Ligand SMILES: *[C@@H](C(=O)O)[C@H](O)C(=O)N[C@@H](CC(C)C)C(=O)NCCCCNC(N)=[NH2+]
């Protein structure tokens with residue numbers, strides 16, 4: 001795998017979204033991974049619908065939380081997921097209104113990265129594209145991040161509470177990192193992104209719950 | 216639905232097991248629901264293997280915890296689950312050693328009970344058979360239960376931490392309850408069972424994470 005890769009430079013990443021108060025991080029993380037694979041397989045970059053997931057992934061709990069693997073399993077069983085334009089995000093749970101006419105992507109399954117293995121996560125990001133991951137984003141330092149490579153020894157790798165998207169990895173001034181796309185709007189962090197310490201003992205649990213959809 | 220049903224009286228429930236220190240409650244709960252459906256569809260009552268689930272349901276975390284829906288999805292995708300005799304429980308994680316020769320049951324999917332709806336749970340238990348459920352089993356009062364219908368206002372329906380099996384429901388001396396099969400051995404509770412308050416505002420979260428396998 002290359003020493004660094006940034007899928008934003010390949011046009012695999014859509015604009016940063018804002019999930020609002022709804023606990024739908026899992027939906028944005030899942031949509032992000034699917035958007036990356038969609039670009040890789042079709043050549044087109046499109047916004048997919050997290051609301052479609054929020055309202056229809058019955059295995060999850062809508063704004064009450066959920067898992068990315070569950071989301072991928074839904075898309076596979078449902079035979080598709082709508083584009084954002086065909087099923088707009090409103091930040092609240094509603095009845096499932098999936099319309100196949102607005103289908104913009106399909107999923108043939110998913111794969112998980114070996115728990116805690118950052119080397120495997122690196123290889124998966126290099127070979128596949130953006131990967132859905134989960135971290136502990138409860139620290140004040142995380143929420144007020146603005147630049148540099150984030151590391152706080154207080155992060156608890158066993159307290160995963162927020163799903164995000166690893167769109168790449170690299171090194172900044174000698175500090176290896178993961179390029180993370182968040183869903184808290186373009187004004188949070190560095191234009192919606194945060195560089196998180198890589199190879200620093202699985203900081204914040206970055207490699208504890210990673211997965212990607214098959215397409 | 217009848218005013219009461221006890222599947223143990225129909226021979227749909229296997230002996231009470233002991234999960235040990237391993238956090239495999241989800242595996243025993245899932246196996247319990249599958250054993251019930253297996254009896255209903257074949258007429259034979261057999262012990263299914265929670266170890267098969269612990270070692271092979273990659274979507275879960277073995278002794279670190281997991282979900283029943285994930286377990287059912289595995290059995291469906293794997294095209295089967297081994298009997299206990301063909302894949303013995305040891306209470307620790309090992310590599311997946313599933314052997315189709317020992318297949319004792321199949322799964323065609325799963326269904327979830329509407330969140331928090333005890334009426335729906337009652338109807339599901341009556342029409343389907345034993346149903347996998349999750350509760351807050353952290354209270355000292357729960358752990359030292361011995362008889363009667365269990366109710367502790369301190370139970371938190373939002374703090375689900377232990378999966379069990381609803382093998383029936385009824386009423387004891389005017390107190391409506393759920394007949395719950397635990398996995399803490401035959402010496403815990405009442406021969407491994409506990410009667411939990413039913414229709415008392417979803418006590419302990421009994422109807423918050425219920426599901427059953429399709430067969
Ligand atoms: C994340 C966010 O919006 O900031 C959101 O709370 C979320 O989905 N959190 C997840 C945790 C990460 C994926 C680690 C969560 O809490 N998941 C558990 C959901 C409850 C389990 N039950 C069901 N139905 N799956």
Ligand SMILES: *[C@@H](C(=O)O)[C@H](O)C(=O)N[C@@H](CC(C)C)C(=O)NCCCCNC(N)=[NH2+]
Nearest residue numbers: 238239240241274275276280281349375376
């Ligand atoms: C229950 C027990 O053994 O007493 C055991 O801890 C367990 O599986 N608990 C579940 C909770 C109930 C089903 C509500 C649990 O903690 N599940 C979450 C597992 C972590 C999520 N990640 C994966 N890989 N599914």
Ligand SMILES: [Ca+2]
Nearest residue numbers: 069070284285
């Ligand atoms: Ca699942």
